[PDB]
Short mmCIF file of C-alpha atoms and ligand atoms in Angstrom, two decimals:
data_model
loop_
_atom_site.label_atom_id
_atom_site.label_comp_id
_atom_site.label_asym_id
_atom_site.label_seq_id
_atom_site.Cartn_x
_atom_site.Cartn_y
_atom_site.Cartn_z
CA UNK A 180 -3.20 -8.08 21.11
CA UNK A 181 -0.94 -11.19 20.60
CA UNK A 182 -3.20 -13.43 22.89
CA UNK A 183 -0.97 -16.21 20.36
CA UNK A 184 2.20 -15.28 19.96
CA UNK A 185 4.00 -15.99 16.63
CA UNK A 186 7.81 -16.55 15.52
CA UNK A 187 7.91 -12.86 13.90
CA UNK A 188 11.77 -12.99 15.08
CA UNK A 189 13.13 -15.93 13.65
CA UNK A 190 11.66 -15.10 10.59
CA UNK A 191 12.94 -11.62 10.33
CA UNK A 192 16.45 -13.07 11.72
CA UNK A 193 16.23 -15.74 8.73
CA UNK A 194 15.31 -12.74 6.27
CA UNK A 195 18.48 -10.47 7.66
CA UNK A 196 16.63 -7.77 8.68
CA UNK A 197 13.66 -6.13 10.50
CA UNK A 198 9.95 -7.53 9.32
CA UNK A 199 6.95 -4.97 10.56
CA UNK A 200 3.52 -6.60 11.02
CA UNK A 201 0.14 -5.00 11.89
CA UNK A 202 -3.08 -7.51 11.42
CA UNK A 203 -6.78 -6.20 12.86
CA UNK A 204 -9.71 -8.79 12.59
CA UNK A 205 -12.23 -6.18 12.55
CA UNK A 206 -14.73 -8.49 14.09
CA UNK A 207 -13.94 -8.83 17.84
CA UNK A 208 -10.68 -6.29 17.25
CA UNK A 209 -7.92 -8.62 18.28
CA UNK A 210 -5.28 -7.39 16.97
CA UNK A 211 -1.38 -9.47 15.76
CA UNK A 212 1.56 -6.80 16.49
CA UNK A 213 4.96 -7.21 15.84
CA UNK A 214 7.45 -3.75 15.22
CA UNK A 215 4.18 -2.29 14.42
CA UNK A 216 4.73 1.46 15.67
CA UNK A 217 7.69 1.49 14.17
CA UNK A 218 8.78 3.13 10.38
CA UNK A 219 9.31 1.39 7.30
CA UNK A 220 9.52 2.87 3.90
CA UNK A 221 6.35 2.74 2.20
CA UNK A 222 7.62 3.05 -1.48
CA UNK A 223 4.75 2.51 -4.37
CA UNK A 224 2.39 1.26 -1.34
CA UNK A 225 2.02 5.14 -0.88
CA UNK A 226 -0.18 4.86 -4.20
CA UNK A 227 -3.03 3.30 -2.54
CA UNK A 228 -3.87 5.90 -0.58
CA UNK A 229 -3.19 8.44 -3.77
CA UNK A 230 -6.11 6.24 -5.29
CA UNK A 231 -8.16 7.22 -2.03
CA UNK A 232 -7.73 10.84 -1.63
CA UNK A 233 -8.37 11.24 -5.19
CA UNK A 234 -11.56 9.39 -4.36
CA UNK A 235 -12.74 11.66 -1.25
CA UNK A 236 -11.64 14.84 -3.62
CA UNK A 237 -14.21 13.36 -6.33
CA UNK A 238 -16.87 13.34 -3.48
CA UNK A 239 -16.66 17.22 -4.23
CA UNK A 240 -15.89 16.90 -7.76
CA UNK A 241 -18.43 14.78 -9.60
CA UNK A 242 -16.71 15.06 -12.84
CA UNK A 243 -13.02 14.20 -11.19
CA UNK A 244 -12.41 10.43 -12.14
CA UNK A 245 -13.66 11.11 -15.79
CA UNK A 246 -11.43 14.01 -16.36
CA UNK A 247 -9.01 13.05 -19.32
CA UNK A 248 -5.24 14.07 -18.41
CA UNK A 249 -2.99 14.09 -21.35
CA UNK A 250 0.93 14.27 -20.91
CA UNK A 251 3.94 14.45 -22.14
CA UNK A 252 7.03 12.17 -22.76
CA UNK A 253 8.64 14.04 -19.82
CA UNK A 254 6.05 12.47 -17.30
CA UNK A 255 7.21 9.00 -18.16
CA UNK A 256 8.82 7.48 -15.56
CA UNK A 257 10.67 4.21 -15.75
CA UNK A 258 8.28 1.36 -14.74
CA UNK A 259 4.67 3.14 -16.33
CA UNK A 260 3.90 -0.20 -17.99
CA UNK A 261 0.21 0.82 -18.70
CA UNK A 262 0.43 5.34 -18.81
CA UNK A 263 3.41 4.41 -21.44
CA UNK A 264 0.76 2.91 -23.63
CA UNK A 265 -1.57 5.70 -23.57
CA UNK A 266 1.17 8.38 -24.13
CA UNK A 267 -0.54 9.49 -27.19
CA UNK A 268 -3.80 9.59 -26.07
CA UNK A 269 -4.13 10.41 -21.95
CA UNK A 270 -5.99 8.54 -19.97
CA UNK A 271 -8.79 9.37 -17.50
CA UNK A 272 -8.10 10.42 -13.83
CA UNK A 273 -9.50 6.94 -12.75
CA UNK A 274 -7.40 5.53 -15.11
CA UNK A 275 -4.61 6.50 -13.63
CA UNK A 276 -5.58 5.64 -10.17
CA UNK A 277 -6.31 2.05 -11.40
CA UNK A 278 -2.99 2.03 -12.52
CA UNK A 279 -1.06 3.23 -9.95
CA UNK A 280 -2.83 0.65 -7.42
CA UNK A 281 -2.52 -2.24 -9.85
CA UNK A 282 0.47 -1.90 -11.45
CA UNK A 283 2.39 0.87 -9.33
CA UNK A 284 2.66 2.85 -12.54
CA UNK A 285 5.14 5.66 -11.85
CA UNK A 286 3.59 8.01 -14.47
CA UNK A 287 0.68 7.85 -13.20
CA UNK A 288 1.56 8.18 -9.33
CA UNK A 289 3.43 11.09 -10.04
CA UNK A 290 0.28 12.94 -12.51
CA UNK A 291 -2.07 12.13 -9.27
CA UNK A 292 0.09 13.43 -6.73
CA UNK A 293 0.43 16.85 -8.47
CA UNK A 294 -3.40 16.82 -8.94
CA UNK A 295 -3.80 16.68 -4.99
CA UNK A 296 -0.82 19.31 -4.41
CA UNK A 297 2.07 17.21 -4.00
CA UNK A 298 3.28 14.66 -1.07
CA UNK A 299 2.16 17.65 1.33
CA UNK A 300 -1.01 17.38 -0.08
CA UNK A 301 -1.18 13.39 -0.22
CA UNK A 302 0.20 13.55 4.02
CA UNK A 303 -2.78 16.39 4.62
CA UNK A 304 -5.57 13.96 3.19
CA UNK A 305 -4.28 11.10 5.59
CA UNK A 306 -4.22 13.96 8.33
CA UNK A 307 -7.68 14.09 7.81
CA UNK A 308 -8.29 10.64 8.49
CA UNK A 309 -7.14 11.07 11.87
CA UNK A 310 -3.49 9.66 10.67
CA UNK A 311 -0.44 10.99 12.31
CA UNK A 312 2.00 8.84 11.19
CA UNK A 313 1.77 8.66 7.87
CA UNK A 314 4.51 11.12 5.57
CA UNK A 315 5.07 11.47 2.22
CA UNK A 316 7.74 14.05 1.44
CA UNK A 317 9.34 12.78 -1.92
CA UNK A 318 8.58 12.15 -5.31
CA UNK A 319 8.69 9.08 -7.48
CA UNK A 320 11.30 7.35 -8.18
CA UNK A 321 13.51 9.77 -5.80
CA UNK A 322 11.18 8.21 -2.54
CA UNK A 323 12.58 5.07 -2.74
CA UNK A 324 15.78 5.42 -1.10
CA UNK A 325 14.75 3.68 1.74
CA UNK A 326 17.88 5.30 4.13
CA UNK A 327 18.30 3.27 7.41
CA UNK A 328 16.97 6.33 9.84
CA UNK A 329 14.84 8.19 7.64
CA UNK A 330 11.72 9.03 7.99
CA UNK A 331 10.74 10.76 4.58
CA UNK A 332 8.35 9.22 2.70
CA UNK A 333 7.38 5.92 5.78
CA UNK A 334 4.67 5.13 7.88
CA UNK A 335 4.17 2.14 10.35
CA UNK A 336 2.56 -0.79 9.80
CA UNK A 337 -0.06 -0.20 12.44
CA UNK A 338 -0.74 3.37 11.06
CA UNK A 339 -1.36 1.89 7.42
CA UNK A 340 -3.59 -1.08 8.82
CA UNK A 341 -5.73 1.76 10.90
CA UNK A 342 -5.70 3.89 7.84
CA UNK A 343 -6.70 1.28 5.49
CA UNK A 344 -9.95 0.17 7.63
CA UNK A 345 -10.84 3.67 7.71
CA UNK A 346 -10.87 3.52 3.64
CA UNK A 347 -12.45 0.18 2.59
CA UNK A 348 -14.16 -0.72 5.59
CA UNK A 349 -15.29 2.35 7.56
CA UNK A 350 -16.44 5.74 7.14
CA UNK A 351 -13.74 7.83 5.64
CA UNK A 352 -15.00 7.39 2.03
CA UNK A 353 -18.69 7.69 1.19
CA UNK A 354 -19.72 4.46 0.10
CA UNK A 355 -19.45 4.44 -3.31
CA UNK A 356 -16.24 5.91 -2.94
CA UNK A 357 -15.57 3.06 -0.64
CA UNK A 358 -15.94 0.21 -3.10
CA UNK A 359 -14.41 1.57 -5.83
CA UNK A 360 -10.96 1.87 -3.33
CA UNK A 361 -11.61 -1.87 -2.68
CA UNK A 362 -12.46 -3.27 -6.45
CA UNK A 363 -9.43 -1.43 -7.62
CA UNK A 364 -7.26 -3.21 -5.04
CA UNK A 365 -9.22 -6.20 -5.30
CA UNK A 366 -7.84 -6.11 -9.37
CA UNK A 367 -4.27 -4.94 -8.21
CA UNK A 368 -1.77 -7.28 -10.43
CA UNK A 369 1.31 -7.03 -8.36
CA UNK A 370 0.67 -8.84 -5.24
CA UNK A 371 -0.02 -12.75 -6.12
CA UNK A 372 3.44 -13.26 -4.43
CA UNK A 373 3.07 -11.32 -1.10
CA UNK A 374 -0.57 -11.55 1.44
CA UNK A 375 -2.12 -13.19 -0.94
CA UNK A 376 -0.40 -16.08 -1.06
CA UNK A 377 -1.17 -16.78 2.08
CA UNK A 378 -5.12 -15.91 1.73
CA UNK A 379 -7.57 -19.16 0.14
CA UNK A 380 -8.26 -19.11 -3.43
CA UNK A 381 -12.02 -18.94 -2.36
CA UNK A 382 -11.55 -16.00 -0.02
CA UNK A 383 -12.07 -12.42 -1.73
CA UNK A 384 -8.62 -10.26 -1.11
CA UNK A 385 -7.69 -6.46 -2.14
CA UNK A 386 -3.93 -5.34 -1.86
CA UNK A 387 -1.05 -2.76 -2.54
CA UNK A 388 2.52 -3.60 -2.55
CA UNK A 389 5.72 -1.66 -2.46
CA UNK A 390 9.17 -2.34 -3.60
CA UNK A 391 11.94 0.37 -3.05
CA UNK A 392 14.67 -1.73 -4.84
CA UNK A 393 17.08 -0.95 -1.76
CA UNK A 394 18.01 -1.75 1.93
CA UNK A 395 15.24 -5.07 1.12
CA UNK A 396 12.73 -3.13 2.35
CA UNK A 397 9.74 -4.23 -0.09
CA UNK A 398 5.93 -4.32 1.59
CA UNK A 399 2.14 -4.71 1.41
CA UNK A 400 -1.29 -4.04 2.90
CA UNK A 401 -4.32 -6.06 2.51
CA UNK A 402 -8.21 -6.19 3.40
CA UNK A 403 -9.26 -9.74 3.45
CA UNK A 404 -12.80 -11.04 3.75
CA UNK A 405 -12.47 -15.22 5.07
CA UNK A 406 -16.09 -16.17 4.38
CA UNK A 407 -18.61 -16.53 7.36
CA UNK A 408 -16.46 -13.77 9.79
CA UNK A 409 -15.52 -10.68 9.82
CA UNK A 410 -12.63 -9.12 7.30
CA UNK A 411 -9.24 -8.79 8.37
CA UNK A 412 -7.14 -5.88 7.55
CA UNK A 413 -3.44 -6.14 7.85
CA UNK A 414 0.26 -4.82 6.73
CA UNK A 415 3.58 -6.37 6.19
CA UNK A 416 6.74 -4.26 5.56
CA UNK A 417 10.22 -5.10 5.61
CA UNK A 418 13.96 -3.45 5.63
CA UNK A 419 17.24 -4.88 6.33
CA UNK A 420 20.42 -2.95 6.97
CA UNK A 421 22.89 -2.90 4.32
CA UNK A 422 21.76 -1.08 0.72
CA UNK A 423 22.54 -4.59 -1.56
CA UNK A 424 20.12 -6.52 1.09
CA UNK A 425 17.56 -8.11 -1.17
CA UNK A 426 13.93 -7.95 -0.33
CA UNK A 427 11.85 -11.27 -0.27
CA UNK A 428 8.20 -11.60 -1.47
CA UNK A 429 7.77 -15.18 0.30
CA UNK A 430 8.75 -13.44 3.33
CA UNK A 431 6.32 -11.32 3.12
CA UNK A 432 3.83 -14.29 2.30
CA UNK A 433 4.90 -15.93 5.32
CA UNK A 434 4.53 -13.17 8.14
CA UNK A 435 1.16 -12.63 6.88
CA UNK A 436 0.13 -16.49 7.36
CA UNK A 437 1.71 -15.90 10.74
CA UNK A 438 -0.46 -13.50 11.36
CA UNK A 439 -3.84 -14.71 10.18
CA UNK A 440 -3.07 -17.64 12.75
CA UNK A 441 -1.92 -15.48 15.31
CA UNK A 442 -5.79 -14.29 14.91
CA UNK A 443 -7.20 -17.75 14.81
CA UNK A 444 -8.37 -17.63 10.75
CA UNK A 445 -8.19 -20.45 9.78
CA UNK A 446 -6.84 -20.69 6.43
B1 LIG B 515 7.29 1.71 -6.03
O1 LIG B 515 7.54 0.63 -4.94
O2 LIG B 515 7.91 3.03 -5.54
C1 LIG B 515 8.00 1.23 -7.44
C2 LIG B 515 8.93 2.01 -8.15
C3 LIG B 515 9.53 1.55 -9.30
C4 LIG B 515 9.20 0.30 -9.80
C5 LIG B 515 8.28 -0.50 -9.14
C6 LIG B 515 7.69 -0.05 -7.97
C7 LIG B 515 6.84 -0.97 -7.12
O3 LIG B 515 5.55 -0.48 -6.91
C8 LIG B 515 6.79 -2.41 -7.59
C9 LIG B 515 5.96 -3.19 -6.56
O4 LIG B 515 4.86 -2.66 -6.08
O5 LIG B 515 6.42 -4.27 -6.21
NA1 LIG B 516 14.03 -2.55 13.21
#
């Protein structure tokens, strides 16, 4: 763990706030830690792991991801860029998983999480992933609030990393299961900004972001596969004290650059 250490602090101190960083190369498990145990707000990167548990559920439910789900104006949320375009028609329980990964839709996020029994239900899948940390306790858009202190609806960025090599890369999904989770963050539209800009064009990258619109607490978690070593898995999240803070995607870019050389990718 931090055999290399990195300038995590001056660039959280530049940013005005705290910056949370978890990177595992899953090769020889070094791991790149900085304000990794503690909590962050996970906002719409909670919708990643919706898209997984609705995976492991259709492990037991063959017809799950086909099932069509239609709904009303009243499930609209404000940003559902692609549910808002199927309002008259529903759209497939994989169809709204795609979207909430790719484009955070809030419709959608909010159909999925009553399918699974609500944020108990998303925080009892993670339980059974052998993840402690994670909570979800809210709803969208009310889980965005992002209060300094409060723990609703966060995780840590180690806790997400661990959770997320579970999911893509290890055992927690049955393998099919397992690569649809990484091709629909592998399409995820939202993230050119954040890890990715700091991953090679020719490298092959999944992602989910978050954004709570407060307290600049804004995020993202990544699998990465560098060619010719092992894939990296890593988290970035961010918060900053005062409610008008603005969050900053190129810090985000640049903490996760810090970390992939903190590991010794070159990139
Ligand atoms: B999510 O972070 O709770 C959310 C809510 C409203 C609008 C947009 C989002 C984000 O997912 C946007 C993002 O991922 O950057
Ligand atoms: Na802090």
């Amino acid at each position: 763990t931090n055999l290399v250490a990195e300038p995590f602090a001056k660039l959280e101190q530049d940013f005005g706030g705290s910056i949370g960083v978890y990177a595992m190369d899953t090769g020889s498990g070094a791991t790149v830690s900085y304000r990794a145990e503690e909590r962050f707000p996970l906002c719409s990167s909670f919708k990643g792991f919706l898209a997984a548990a609705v995976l492991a559920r259709s492990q037991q439910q063959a017809g799950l991801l086909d099932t069509p789900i239609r709904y009303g104006k009243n499930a609209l949320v404000p940003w559902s860029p692609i549910s808002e375009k199927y309002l008259t028609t529903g759209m497939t329980v994989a169809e709204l998983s795609a979207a909430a990964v790719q484009y955070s839709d809030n419709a959608a996020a909010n159909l999925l999480l009553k399918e699974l029994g609500g944020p108990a239900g998303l925080t009892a899948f993670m339980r059974s992933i052998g993840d402690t940390t994670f909570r979800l306790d809210r709803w969208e858009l009310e889980l965005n609030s992002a209060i300094p202190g409060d723990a609703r609806d966060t995780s840590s960025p180690r806790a997400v990393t661990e959770s997320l090599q579970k999911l893509t890369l290890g055992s927690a999904l049955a393998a099919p299961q397992r690569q649809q989770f990484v091709d629909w963050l592998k399409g995820n539209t939202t993230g050119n900004h954040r890890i990715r800009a700091a991953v090679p064009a020719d490298w092959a990258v999944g992602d989910k972001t978050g954004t709570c619109g407060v307290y600049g607490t804004a995020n993202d978690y990544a699998v990465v596969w560098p060619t010719g070593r092992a894939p990296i898995v890593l988290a970035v999240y961010t918060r900053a004290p005062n409610k008008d803070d603005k969050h900053s995607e190129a810090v985000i870019a640049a903490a996760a650059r810090l970390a992939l050389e903190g590991l010794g990718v070159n990139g």
